[PDB]
């Protein structure tokens, strides 16, 4: 997998060497094709995972993501052509390159055989992200948000560093292939009960768990649209990908060491879903929607039943695409409105007829409408959770009712009701804004036709 | 300085560490340490400002008593073994003295009070020498005697330094002292692995030298001893803003940059030796060091602090360039990580 | 560590014994990296000194890309040796002190009985 | 090119990684042994030069 | 030692006088010249860990 990567690196030379006026089209047009080369990995006509080479591999779980990581770079670069079009021609070429490095790094992290290669690349992604959030962040508080995003991930990260070096000594190689075909069975000691927490905690932090998710609402609030898309679509899912490949070892402990997180997540799912119900900042509501719909995932990567896992793989890819779509349209309202407040800007369909159709489809993806991969995902996690304990439906049942309420409230108070009297007149929709959306949903429609590709390792 | 004097002094400041390293007769190692003490004091008071005399008089007393303690260890050994050099048989107290003494000259842990203060009153230039070409000498003496020193003490001085360095740095706003504090911290990691794998001490030093030498020549390019002063870097010289950003995050352990390797292999070696208690606590507060590094990042790069009108005047005039060493030592430092296996 | 080994060359860079090892291919990814590492140093310099970034010092750019690379071949040539000594040393010991590193028989899974924790 | 290439490539990747793993662990055992044993080329700490003694006729009987 | 510029250069400015059995002026052997010899020709080729 060096075509999904080397051609990517070369994007950096192109963003720099290219003309200031033509820099945007060379980069966006080329990474669209970079995504097309990424599609070749999907050709698995057999079960055997595709070990491209010693360090680089792609199995069913990584492949559905590498393609998404390559896909969003085009979109990210199309959603940030407006803001970042007021810059000095060298601030742009830095932002474009920053976005380019994220997927170079993220493509490799999702396509990495050695778990510590994951760690080095895993924690590197913070550098590009922190720059995108802090340097171009509009609000006074991004310095703070950046600190929260760096420390919560970093304090979790050093325990994983110690744990992975620890298993290398215990087993003798951090190669995901071998670690899988070798006998690593923890022994339920008090210490192992700590190892397990060391490995999972760093992944559980960037996958916002109810206890440590305050970093994500603060980060996406002041982050520029491209950073918020990356955090929701690819960055948070780095934590999920890690939990799937790391729990191959630590096989016995999670049977009983998971209860704490599972309950934290399911109760967390309800409270995070509910506070979405009365949050005035739209970007705030989407972020907590992201916490709740990701709290379902940590509760399926821990129950560990075949269906959970691919419920997880289905939902992660699906929610990634949906969340961005929501964060992308939130930005389009923010740029004309100039405020994140949900109460202002009422009635837009009256003035932006189509964006409202995109808003409606994004919300229906947000809630579980049935001919969507989003529902298949939740339906499956719901099933397994029920298997874990029939009572789980109650808590995963209060979340579904709340999820319907906030998803439609975003449509009802942003895209319906009487028009706002006279905010700065809202200029019509650009074709870029609409495509950036179409590019998010057309793939959501196509993937829903053949869900098999994003089903995970389990199935 | 009459250029002749400059030569004699500089030769001594350079013959000082070199005799230490080359000789085996400890005595000759002691006088190597003694010269370094004599040569550095003249340069320290070059401005001869009231702050400077204070600096040198502290540096000298701290250095002198430690030098006398190191000599006492050699004198005692001479009577416990006729040899003029530490051996397997050496009384444990004899070696511990040498650790404390040498940990004072290097300024590690509970003897970390002199360094921040002398780093504050000396010029940026002599600051570098006082931080990096004066640590080579004592460390050489320790690295030579590693097989014999105590694992317990070193670790305590190691951990303490890491903490003191980190905590001290958080509050400081003067750059010279932020660096002094960082050096205490890095010096700590170095002395942690000495008992186990000296060869890694020599890596955690070089990398510190290849990181600090560019960082200081950066601080002086604009001769800013204040963060507020380095924050207006964007107006005085915009290009160094990019690398100053990476070098400081490299000084802390963040993974893509070269700075991770020293911490990573030291942790790998300590876990190989089973100190998974000690290594863990060190790595954790090591994370405190990055917080103050990033706070500076914020002021200098990620956010643009307001500047005075006269800054436009300094822009007009051609900026005297930074030596080439900056580049070669900025890149070899910010990004060599892809080449770690051969470094270790 | 590896110092104190018999025959150690007290101050030499790479003892001739390292002749026996294969020479590093000049295009070894690493040496090529050092090259790029170098080009960047050059470009960076131009930038910090405020010169046209790429179109200036085309002589220097060469000195850099060619100094770093030169250094590489002769360094890697050594680091390669050091690692090679490590095996000579390591493998030898495994034998000279055989009992301590005994070959082990691993029972076919048929025989071994790892317990099965059910997920249910 | 086929199912054959990845299956055979993955087995080659596993053999390199399995052999690297066994050696890395044996290093740690050899390095534990030579440190304490001191019977191997690594961890051979120095003692003074024999070349500097003086077995020459001294000025007093009984050296 | 750390940098053996002495063995390399072949010079011996610091080794000739490190132990009591080294050449004493006018060949006046010191006390113990007998032992130290016996204790360093023993520990020669045997590293410290096994000179102890």
């Amino acid at each position: 997998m060096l075509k999904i990567i080397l051609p990517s690196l070369m994007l950096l030379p192109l963003t720099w060497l290219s003309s200031p006026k033509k820099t945007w089209t060379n980069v966006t047009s080329y990474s669209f094709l970079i995504s097309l080369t990424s599609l070749t990995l999907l050709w698995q006509t057999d079960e055997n995972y595709k070990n491209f080479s010693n360090m680089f591999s792609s199995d069913p779980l990584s492949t559905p993501l590498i393609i998404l990581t390559a896909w969003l770079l085009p979109l990210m670069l199309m959603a940030s052509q407006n803001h970042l079009k007021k810059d000095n021609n060298v601030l742009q070429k830095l932002y474009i390159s920053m976005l380019i490095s994220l997927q170079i790094l993220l493509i490799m992290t999702f396509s990495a055989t050695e778990l510590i290669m994951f760690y080095i690349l895993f924690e590197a992604t913070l550098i590009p992200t922190l720059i995108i959030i802090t340097r171009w962040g509009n609000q006074t508080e991004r310095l703070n948000a950046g600190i929260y995003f760096l420390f919560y991930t970093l304090i979790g990260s050093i325990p994983l560093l110690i744990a992975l070096i620890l298993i290398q000594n215990h087993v003798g190689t951090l190669n995901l292939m071998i670690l899988s075909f070798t006998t690593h069975t923890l022994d339920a000691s008090w210490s192992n009960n700590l190892l397990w927490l060391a490995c999972m905690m760093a992944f559980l932090i960037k996958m916002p768990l109810y206890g440590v998710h305050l970093w994500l609402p603060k980060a996406h609030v002041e982050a520029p649209i491209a950073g918020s898309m990356i955090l929701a679509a690819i960055l948070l899912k780095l934590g999920s990908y890690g939990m799937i490949r790391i729990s191959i070892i630590l096989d016995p402990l999670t049977k009983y060491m998971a209860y704490p997180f599972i309950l934290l997540s399911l109760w967390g799912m309800i409270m995070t879903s509910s506070i979405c119900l009365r949050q005035t900042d739209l970007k705030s509501l989407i972020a907590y929607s992201s916490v709740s719909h990701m709290a379902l995932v940590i509760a399926s990567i821990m129950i560990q039943t075949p269906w959970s896992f691919m419920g997880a793989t289905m939902l992660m890819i699906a929610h990634g695409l949906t969340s961005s779509l929501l964060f992308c349209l939130a930005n389009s309202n923010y740029e004309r409105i100039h405020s994140r407040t949900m109460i202002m800007a009422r009635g837009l369909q009256m003035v932006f007829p189509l964006m409202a159709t995109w808003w409606l489809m994004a919300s229906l993806a947000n809630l579980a409408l049935p001919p969507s991969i989003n529902l298949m995902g939740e339906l499956f996690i719901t099933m397994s959770l029920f298997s874990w304990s029939n009572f789980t439906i109650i808590l995963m049942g209060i979340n579904i009712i709340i999820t319907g309420m906030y998803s439609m409230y975003m449509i009802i108070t942003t895209q319906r009701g009487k028009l706002t009297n006279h905010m700065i007149n809202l200029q019509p929709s650009h074709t870029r804004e609409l495509t950036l959306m179409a590019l998010h949903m057309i793939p959501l429609i196509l993937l829903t036709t053949s869900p098999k590709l994003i089903t995970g390792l389990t199935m | 300085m009459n250029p002749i004097t400059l030569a004699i002094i500089y030769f001594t400041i350079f013959l000082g560490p070199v005799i230490t390293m080359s000789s085996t007769n400890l005595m000759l190692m002691w006088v190597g340490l003694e010269f370094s003490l004599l040569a550095i004091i003249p340069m320290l008071i070059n401005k001869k400002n009231p702050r400077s005399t204070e600096a040198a008089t502290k540096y000298f007393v701290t250095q002198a008593t430690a030098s006398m303690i190191i000599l006492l260890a050699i004198v005692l050994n001479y009577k416990q073994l006729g040899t003029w050099m530490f051996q397997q048989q050496t009384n444990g107290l004899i070696l511990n003295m040498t650790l404390m003494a040498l940990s004072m000259k290097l300024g590690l842990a509970p003897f970390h009070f002199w360094l921040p203060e002398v780093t504050q009153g000396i010029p940026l230039h002599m600051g570098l020498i006082l931080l990096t070409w004066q640590k080579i000498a004592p460390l050489s003496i320790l690295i030579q005697i590693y097989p014999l020193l105590n694992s317990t003490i070193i670790l305590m001085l190691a951990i303490t330094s890491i903490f003191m360095g980190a905590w001290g740095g958080l509050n400081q706003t003067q750059m010279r002292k932020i660096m002094a504090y960082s050096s205490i911290a890095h010096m700590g990691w170095m002395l942690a692995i000495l008992p186990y794998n000296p060869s890694l001490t020599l890596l955690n030093l070089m990398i510190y030298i290849i990181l600090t030498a560019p960082m200081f020549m950066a601080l002086m390019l604009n001769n800013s001893m204040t963060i507020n002063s380095i924050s207006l870097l964007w107006n005085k010289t915009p290009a160094m803003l990019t690398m100053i950003s990476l070098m400081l995050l490299s000084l802390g352990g963040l993974p893509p940059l070269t700075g991770f390797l020293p911490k990573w292999i030291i942790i790998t070696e300590l876990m190989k030796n089973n100190c998974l208690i000690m290594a863990t606590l060190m790595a954790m507060m090591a994370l405190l060091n990055l917080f103050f590094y990033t706070r500076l990042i914020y002021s200098t790069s990620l956010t643009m602090f307001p500047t005075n009108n006269n800054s436009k005047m300094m822009t007009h005039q051609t900026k005297t360039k930074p030596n080439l060493m900056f580049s070669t030592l900025a890149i070899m430092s910010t990004m060599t990580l892809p080449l770690a296996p051969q470094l270790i | 560590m590896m110092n104190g080994r018999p025959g150690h060359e007290p101050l030499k860079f790479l003892p001739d014994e390292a002749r026996s090892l294969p020479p590093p291919k000049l295009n070894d990814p690493r040496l090529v990296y050092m090259g790029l590492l170098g080009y960047c140093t050059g470009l960076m310099d131009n930038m910090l000194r405020m010169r046209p970034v790429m179109r200036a010092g085309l002589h220097r750019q060469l000195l850099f890309v060619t100094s770093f690379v030169f250094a590489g071949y002769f360094y890697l040539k050594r680091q390669n040796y050091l690692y090679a000594v490590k095996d000579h040393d390591m493998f030898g010991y495994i034998k000279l002190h055989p009992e301590d590193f005994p070959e082990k028989e691993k029972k076919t899974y048929a025989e071994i009985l790892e317990p099965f924790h059910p997920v249910r | 090119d086929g199912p054959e290439k990845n299956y055979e490539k993955t087995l080659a990747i596993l053999q390199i990684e399995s052999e690297k793993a066994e050696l890395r662990l044996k290093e740690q055992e050899v390095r534990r042994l030579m440190r304490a044993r001191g019977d191997g080329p690594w961890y051979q700490f120095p003692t003074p030069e024999k070349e500097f003694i003086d077995h020459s006729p001294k000025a007093t009987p009984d050296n | 030692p750390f940098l053996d510029i002495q063995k390399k250069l072949g010079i011996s400015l610091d080794r000739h006088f490190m132990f009591l059995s080294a050449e004493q002026p006018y060949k006046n052997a010191a006390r113990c010249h007998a032992f130290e010899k016996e204790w360093i020709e023993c520990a020669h080729g045997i590293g410290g860990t096994r000179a102890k």
Binding site: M117 | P341 | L21, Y83 | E19, K20, G40 | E41
Partner: peptide, 27 residues
């Protein structure tokens, strides 16, 4: 009687086995 010298590992160098066995550096 004096103790024997540590034994001498013997042979000729051969390129290291599988290369630097560092972290995923296939070297």
């Amino acid at each position: 009687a004096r103790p024997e010298p540590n034994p001498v590992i013997e042979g000729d160098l051969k390129p290291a086995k599988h290369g630097t066995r560092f972290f995923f550096w296939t070297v």
